[PDB]
Symmetry: D2
Subunit: 392 residues, 4 copies
Amino acid sequence: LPGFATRAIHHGYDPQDHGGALVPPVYQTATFTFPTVEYGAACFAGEQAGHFYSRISNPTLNLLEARMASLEGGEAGLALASGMGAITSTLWTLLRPGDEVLLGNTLYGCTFAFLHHGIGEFGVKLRHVDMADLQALEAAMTPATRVIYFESPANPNMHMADIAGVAKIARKHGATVVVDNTYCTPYLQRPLELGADLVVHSATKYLSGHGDITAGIVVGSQALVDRIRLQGLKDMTGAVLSPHDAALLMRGIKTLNLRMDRHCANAQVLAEFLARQPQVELIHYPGLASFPQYTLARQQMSQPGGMIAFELKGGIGAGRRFMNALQLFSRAVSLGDAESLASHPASMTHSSYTPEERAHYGISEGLVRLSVGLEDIDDLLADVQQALKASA
Amino acid sequence: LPGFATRAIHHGYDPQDHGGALVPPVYQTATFTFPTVEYGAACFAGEQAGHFYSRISNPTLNLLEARMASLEGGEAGLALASGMGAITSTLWTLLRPGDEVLLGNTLYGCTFAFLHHGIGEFGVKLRHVDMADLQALEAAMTPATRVIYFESPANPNMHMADIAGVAKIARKHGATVVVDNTYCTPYLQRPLELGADLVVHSATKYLSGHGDITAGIVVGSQALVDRIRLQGLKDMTGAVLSPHDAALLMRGIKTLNLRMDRHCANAQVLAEFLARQPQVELIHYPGLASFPQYTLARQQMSQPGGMIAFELKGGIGAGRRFMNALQLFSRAVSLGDAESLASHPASMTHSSYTPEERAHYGISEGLVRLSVGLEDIDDLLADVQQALKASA
Amino acid sequence: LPGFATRAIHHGYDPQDHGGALVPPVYQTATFTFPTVEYGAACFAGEQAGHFYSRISNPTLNLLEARMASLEGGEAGLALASGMGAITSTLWTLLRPGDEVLLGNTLYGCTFAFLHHGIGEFGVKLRHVDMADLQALEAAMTPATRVIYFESPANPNMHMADIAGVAKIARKHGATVVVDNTYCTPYLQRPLELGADLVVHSATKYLSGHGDITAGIVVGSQALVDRIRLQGLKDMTGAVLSPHDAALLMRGIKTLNLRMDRHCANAQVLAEFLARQPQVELIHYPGLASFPQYTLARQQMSQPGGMIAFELKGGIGAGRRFMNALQLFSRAVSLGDAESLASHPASMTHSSYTPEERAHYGISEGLVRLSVGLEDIDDLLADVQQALKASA
Amino acid sequence: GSNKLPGFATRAIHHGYDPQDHGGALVPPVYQTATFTFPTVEYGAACFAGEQAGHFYSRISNPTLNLLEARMASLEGGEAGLALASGMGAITSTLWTLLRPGDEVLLGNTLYGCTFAFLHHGIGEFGVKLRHVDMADLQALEAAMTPATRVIYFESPANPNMHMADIAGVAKIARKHGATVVVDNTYCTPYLQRPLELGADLVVHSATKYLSGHGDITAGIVVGSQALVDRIRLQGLKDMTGAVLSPHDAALLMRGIKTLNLRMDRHCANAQVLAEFLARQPQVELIHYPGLASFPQYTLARQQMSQPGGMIAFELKGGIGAGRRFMNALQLFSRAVSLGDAESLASHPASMTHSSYTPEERAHYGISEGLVRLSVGLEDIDDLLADVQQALKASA
Ligand SMILES: CSC/C=C(/NCc1c(COP(=O)(O)O)cnc(C)c1O)C(=O)O
Ligand SMILES: CSC/C=C(/NCc1c(COP(=O)(O)O)cnc(C)c1O)C(=O)O
Ligand SMILES: CSC/C=C(\NCc1c(COP(=O)(O)O)cnc(C)c1O)C(=O)O
Ligand code: MET
């Protein structure tokens, strides 16, 4: 097996099948023609290998899918119009009324809304559990539990789950484990190699790396991915990725290892800085020895990532003023871009929650989240220092 | 009030607001920054204009949306990753368990599959009514009836619905009427002006015109579109259109009127030709007097369209020989491209129906569907001529 | 031999050669690899047929080139980064110091600048001559004359050249005739079929049709085009066209016929309107019976085009008022877009600053030129009408 | 305080763009438009003159291209930038504006093939005189200067043999005599070498190579003084080449420049390990890599380039015959021209990038027949070593 960087650049592509083109040509085409109608009819049956319509399958997208599967260590992949496209296409195809889903305690806002105000209003039972407390997860398992879905680390407090420990319990009771691996990427964490069945990404984030597309990835077994493609995507969401955006995603993926290395090194220095500052009340960063689940972090992630969450002593007022004072960091949702970003999740990413749900599921009101970018670390520190003075 | 072609080129855009740029700049960006966090909070709350995240809203998508709303005569538009994106996003937000939806007799494969094997399996009631028969429709209206959905003309037999007749009934019972206007386009038929509440398009087809993007549009009232954007798209499908694809779609729309004229002219000559041939049992083209619903087609559609359906005497076997001998037409699914396409809906586009579930909903044995393109008519006649000779 | 529109959609491409893709895939790639190095050495020698570097040759560019060659009735085509790309690459290849180039009396501004302040200052002789007047052209020929270069119609006064008469005179001295066919496009005029050796285009204009790319085309004999590719383009200009832009150009070419029909019908109407107005001293439009070269225009052009130039009685000040009053027409240089455009070169384009510094070649004082777009003619008429009233 | 210059990486991501000026878009929107319009026709008069700041036509200037231009200027440490359709578009647009019949250009001993061909068979045939000089030999350069000498033009390291020039030294001689110094900086990028900071007047790039980094576009850049870059914009590009960069391709180039520092770091680290491995090998006659002490101009490399780069040049014992068999055995490296891509490439200049040269012009101007050039990519170094190791086995 070649190394991660070699596969992120080369896997699934030989230039000699495409006129020698070093870069794969872009199949910006909705439909594909047939030499005979029996050949075309065989394609629709699955009996012959080929393409007919890009919503179902497209060669540019397939190469992206194969490459991402290789990177996650899984069998098959599916590319979609957004991260929400990944999650919704996936869960619509795996759940039906009366099924129960076990959720991580804290979730990305639109995932939470999808579950509670979307598929949960169509007869699917939901129950939130602390996926780091394996006793409690075991106790919450019923025979109607079909899916355990969580993020590790969680957006946005960085709460972790023991993935292999959860997978053990799901094997024991017969549930499908679905992990949102957006924050880490396959470069830092591979939930399929720890017993998960499916992983989902917002490829909008680190995998793209440059903030210029919206996209989603699903990786897992050929059996599960084929059902998500032919039902979730085809019929229930229609979240088709543009070949153009798929080509850019592949372009971004070729520097993933180099980007994550720099994201992680910048974030480590910044986290250590913030931990020594008088205005900071507390800080969640997996790379800090004070991180509650530091041991599990080093067990599961090869590096501590580029995301930091912290609270300021002065509460929401100080957080507002910290944020307005930033000149190099931009005030924006999203993450995993070259540009450093900051946000207040209660008023933004986690707006979809009520005040009561945020307090119950762990989204504080004075919390700020930083996506640490690829800028020079001295420039980012100088920006942060002066914003802390301004926060008071 | 400027004419249709004028609005298809200019509506919603003044070059003076974007540094004089004649063509609108492409906002290929996932996220948008805020000058203060208060500004950002306000964007999420809805109480101020601007942008935050392209899955919810993007200025390039907004121009397309506003422009499509003008063409259709609606208050608001929404752009999505595909036709199925538009349909599913619309229906996932309007319906809940115990609601009923009355459908047209014939539907596009994946719409049918979505309805019966997707949302239908989540506690929603389906019932199929002839939407030309107002007596039957009235007798199907239960107080659970929340939505009325149909194509007119229908894919692929060309069945018309009485849009003003249906809307009359729906206004009395408080039902929302949704019309898939893909085949006609706003240039030929505007269902909102005949009383529909929402129109959906596969913009993949005539609106793009060139077969290079997959895309969907929803147009209707502000209040319905706002709900479909903020629930269906945001939370339940994530069917986000690429700004790149939206700029290609806007580019296509700029020649819609000229393209539709030529599609219609070419298809008229070809339909009239196919009527006169001995190998043809029947034919469904709205611009022949022979067409069963000719009078209703003239009241809704300003021209008869680019699509022909027909049967050969010889049946399924003669279909194969005809299709396989076409040398200018291509054997492929889809429609509304510059290139002329030929399709066998049983094995291809309507494969999602079981054998003789096709026959319950009017999908014949030896039905060949043509999407007539923009090529020189004499070349299209010659090609069809020699193909009929080879089907003997 | 298939019709013009059929060739503009299909020529040189079969979907069976590229996985069935209806639309050709875009080779957005700088380099191409070789299976062995003997294969690679052959490619640079010209022995083996393949690809090595997009600046020299790219499959996406080749398809565009073959298609543009088919439309103009030429052996071969070359795609370049702009119309000036095409013109400069052509002339740098064909001329050396001491060679003379014979020039149409009026020329596009940058072509004039290139000839006079560029290649003319490297020892190449220039002479301007009326290319309608065969007596003076024959008298102007010298042994040094190697190239005869002109536009017909000539920007911006619509003056015409006798292409077949010029070619006949060129054949007697072995000189190469190069026609800028930008205004007409191959749909309206085909200078190669009237005896010219090479045609050049700003494909930026009508061929694109939508104002979103800059591109040049050269079409002519294989031997000439090979040399412009391997000398002009490769070494002397580096005016490489992006494959992405070449894909868009081909997308524009698919509606060239329909767009040109509409451009011309709109311009005929606006010309007939302006010819009768009291504010209008003089008008140049090939379709008007009063047009000085009406008979010659109709020998060479199948339709009279989308461009109009006219003179207002009030001179420079009236020109400004008219231009400033247009609400629908945009004040811009360029032509051939869906959007209607107006320029008033006496508010300074064609590079010159006073009366008498003007009018060596026919650029005047109250001359405004219109690129008549694809909008509804009643809207265009209304806009021109109110602008005429404001000009008084 | 605030008068400190931001770091290279910060400027490669941010310089010249505030999201506030474009509806908050984090990524600049792409101006894929040929033409721009005016609010009045007097405002239009001033934009072809140059009293008013603004836009009219993309072949002259465009907001997406201006951002790219200003950003590359910042990185090179020059006043202004220009974006063109290719490396050759940058070179030709520059030389067509600076030279006229009677002028002499002093040229580095070895040049990229199409640059050589442009000079000898192109602009040379239009009355411009040419002289080659070893630009590492400052005494020879001084001796070669004449009062008709107008431009000094060279690459450093040169394509394909890695020969170098003392840029600071050439600039000093040029200051004294009055010539304009133009350096093709393709190989190093502004991350490794900044010829304007050493005294050059203009730098040109094939941005097709490391700046893009991903092999999907063709593109050129010129950076220099405002006066010289304006002249090149309005004469070379506008009238003499028309080598206009697509705004789409300029957006991709900017996307690539955001990872230039990281990619270059990894190119150099990979090539260094690979060069040391090739130095130890029995099949290898010689090897030119600037990071080995055996490199003829080792101290000059160290003095001008902050890292040794991604390009290796070597020769096998067995000559051209052994080249053939080695290159045909590679399975991770690709056989192709170009360089500075994520994918590792191997080529053979005499039949490839330098085919424009005649056989005696290759022996003269330092281009051997058995020379094999490597552009070391971003793959895992153990995968690359293994591929080169098994390829040397089959070349025996
Ligand atoms: C409320 S707007 C902020 C969007 C952000 N996140 C998105 C996201 C998605 C969904 O992915 P798209 O569908 O690609 O966004 C899925 N999974 C995770 C862990 C995510 O963080 C944000 O973090 O700020
Ligand atoms: C025979 S095709 C090989 C392409 C290679 N070279 C490119 C190049 C250019 C020209 O730049 P575009 O015009 O952008 O290619 C200019 N200047 C330098 C120092 C270059 O290396 C090659 O080395 O293999
Ligand atoms: C399985 S092959 C599909 C190609 C065909 N139709 C699609 C279609 C859609 C769906 O739209 P996307 O989601 O944009 O394809 C919606 N509405 C209508 C009337 C449609 O015809 C076809 O061959 O008729
Ligand atoms: C730099 S002058 C540009 C003029 C414009 N391209 C025209 O067609 O007239």
